[PDB]
Amino acid sequence: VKNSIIWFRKGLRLHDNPALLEACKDAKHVYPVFVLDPHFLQQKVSVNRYNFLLESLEDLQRSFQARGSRLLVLRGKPEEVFPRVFREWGVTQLCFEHDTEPYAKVRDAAVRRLAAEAGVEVVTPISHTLYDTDMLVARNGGAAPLTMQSFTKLVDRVGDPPAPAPDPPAAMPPPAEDMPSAAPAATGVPTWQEVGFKEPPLTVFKGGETEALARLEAAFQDPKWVAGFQKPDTDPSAWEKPATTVLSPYLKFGCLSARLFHARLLEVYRRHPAHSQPPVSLRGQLLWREFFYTVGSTTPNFHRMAGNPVCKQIDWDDNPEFLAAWREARTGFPWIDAIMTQLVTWGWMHHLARHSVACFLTRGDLYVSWERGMEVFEEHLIDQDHYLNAANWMWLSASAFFSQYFRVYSPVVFGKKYDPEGRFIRKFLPVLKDMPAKYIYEPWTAPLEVQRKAGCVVGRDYPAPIVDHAVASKACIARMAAAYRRSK
Ligand SMILES: Cc1cc2nc3c(=O)[nH]c(=O)nc-3n(C[C@H](O)[C@H](O)[C@H](O)COP(=O)(O)OP(=O)(O)OC[C@H]3O[C@@H](n4cnc5c(N)ncnc54)[C@H](O)[C@@H]3O)c2cc1C
Ligand SMILES: [Cl-]
Fold this sequence. Notes:
- GO terms for molecular function: deoxyribodipyrimidine photo-lyase activity; DNA binding; FAD binding.
- Its cofactor is FAD.
- Belongs to the DNA photolyase class-1 family.
- Keywords: FAD, Flavoprotein, Nucleotide-binding.
- It contains 21 helices and five strands.
- The longest helix is centred in the N-terminal third of the chain and has 20 residues, at about 45-65.
- Helix content is about 45%, strand content about 5%.
- By secondary structure, the chain is mainly α.
- The protein is globular, with a radius of gyration of 24 Å.
- It has three domains: about 1-125, HUPs (Rossmann fold); about 130-165 and about 210-300, Serine Threonine Protein Phosphatase 5, Tetratricopeptide repeat, CATH 1.25.40.80; about 300-485, Orthogonal Bundle (DNA Cyclobutane Dipyrimidine Photolyase, subunit A, domain 3), CATH 1.10.579.10.
- The protein has a five-stranded parallel β-sheet.
- The structure holds flavin-adenine dinucleotide and chloride ion (CL).
- The site of chloride ion has 4 residues, from helix 18.
């Protein structure tokens, strides 16, 4: 008799899940498993992202219950729980999606060793990325492309990515009954209060495959907008209706198939011959994701500076005071402080909004290491991706992929081009709601009578700017220029 385990780590969905389809094939009992460590906080992670994970697990639970099954949330470490459930459940096959992150390679190699001792077959298909990333490297002569131009030319030679896998059957083989490790009281999905958090999440994006597909269809309600999508032209100040899809948290956890996303993009492109082309198209944005996954997975110490063969060694300053003001959104620049407040409130900001805060902290004004601001992003971002977070921080700090350090965003003028009235600032910084638009981006320039009238006196209700952007940016550009000559 065949008894299988479908192990969820990423790929928290039922659609386009070849690991789930194999586990259900000729199976008498299937055990949907998610391994949860009950001591994760007692050792980092915000309640926004972690509750986003729990909502994604609750969505899988209701989907498995509608097919006669049930999701098992096991507590402990995979190295300690799986050797037990192999014998207890009589497992003959273990299936899970392939992951290329550093911790996953150490973890999955250990579990495969344990599965071989128990005589369990291991099937690990590829469906988190568009292509087999090792195949793309081998097709390129054994090395990953280091530019988007060459990378886009590589995938065009390989062809279309595999089509998404079909849906699982309407009825699944349920877990065996009266199994001690599958007791419902020990395998349920916990709430955010039970895992240890004390403050409630404030984000407006709900997790789960159902919400991911609902947001996918909403983006495709206007095929003209999908075909003519151009990433650099979108509005970072739009918050009532974000200018992009905001599918990043669902692609990070696997709530949405990247291959299903790509398949729907090609259907619209076929009926719109003037559609946008990479790297600015919507398909191009999925290729940025695939590109950073390909380079990051084959580069040692990608997430760091030292020992990173692609990251330039810059003598970033160790200034805890500048980092603290930037982290706590008290820089004195309302454009930056509002974006950082959106980071801690929603866990998601627009791409160009992330450019503004990352440039200001690194090569723009404060000259703080990109590793420090990234630890802040890894804490609060609900779409936090090990490879995408690191690769884009090296981009904005002019350490890798990007080298035009003479391009420095202004924390005053940038947002004013989109939102001259400062509506975005007034939403996330309510202390400036009564400030006139002439001074909403430069509140320290307002006369004292205006500050009093608006109920926002600089230095009392809102902090003064920590630096002079004209003075700070010139010093950073001179130091970046001296760093690019000492490389060679
Ligand atoms: C400093 C910095 C840190 C970032 N950290 C992350 C991160 O941890 N997780 C993350 O998903 N993205 C990250 N990005 C990329 C980008 O900010 C987001 O992917 C994007 O803002 C998400 O909104 P969206 O889903 O509407 O994007 P869309 O424009 O709708 O793009 C569609 C999808 O393509 C991918 N994508 C888009 N732009 C990029 C990009 N520049 N690089 C890689 N993939 C991209 C994402 O999966 C996204 O969901 C970072 C960018 C910067 C500048
Ligand atoms: Cl600018």
